[PDB]
């Protein structure tokens, strides 16, 4: 119920419901056993079937409010220190092997996000 509401909020352009879900995501990190904070938080923001991440889902569905969703998502992944694995994630299945989040922003003709 956490992973699906984040994908639904980013695609339609719900800015304010995104900040409430991301702050709840940090709350689950503290009150927990707390073993591996990079490998868990990367697993929640990634579909395990295809390897699609949240930043890939933002750029496929261009909203009028998508310039702020990229700004919040890149700000969020920095203090948790998984900036490297979040910006350089890839698909894993056979039909799309190697497509990155940079490779979608160029095709959707977004100059300033590039």
């Amino acid at each position: 119920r956490l992973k699906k509401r984040i994908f639904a909020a980013v695609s339609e352009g719900c800015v304010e419901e995104l900040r409430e879900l991301l702050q709840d995501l940090q709350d689950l990190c503290r009150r927990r056993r707390g073993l591996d904070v990079p490998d868990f938080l990367m697993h929640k923001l990634t579909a395990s079937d295809t390897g699609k991440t949240c930043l890939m889902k933002a750029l496929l569905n261009i909203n009028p409010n998508t310039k702020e969703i990229v700004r919040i998502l890149l700000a969020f992944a920095e203090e948790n220190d998984i900036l490297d694995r979040f910006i350089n994630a890839e698909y894993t299945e056979e039909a799309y092997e190697g497509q990155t989040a940079l490779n979608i922003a160029i095709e959707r003709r977004q100059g300033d996000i590039t």
Partner: protein, 64 residues
């Protein structure tokens, strides 16, 4: 126009259980609770560039 008349004459002649086997198109979920049995045509366009909104599938490949 002359060959199109010959095709529609052979289609009225064969029985019903052949006619369901030789049917074109497939059911496609177009909108909320709507199924319309569409036909698929591919094309390549070079001269007009735009950003793509209003599609059905995010994953552009052929499914399976």
């Amino acid at each position: 126009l002359q060959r199109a008349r010959t095709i529609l004459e052979f289609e009225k002649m064969l029985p019903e259980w052949l006619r369901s086997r030789f049917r074109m198109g497939e059911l496609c979920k177009v909108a909320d609770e709507d199924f319309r049995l569409c036909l698929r045509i591919n094309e390549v366009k070079w001269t007009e560039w735009k950003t793509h909104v209003s599609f059905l599938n995010e994953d552009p490949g052929p499914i399976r």
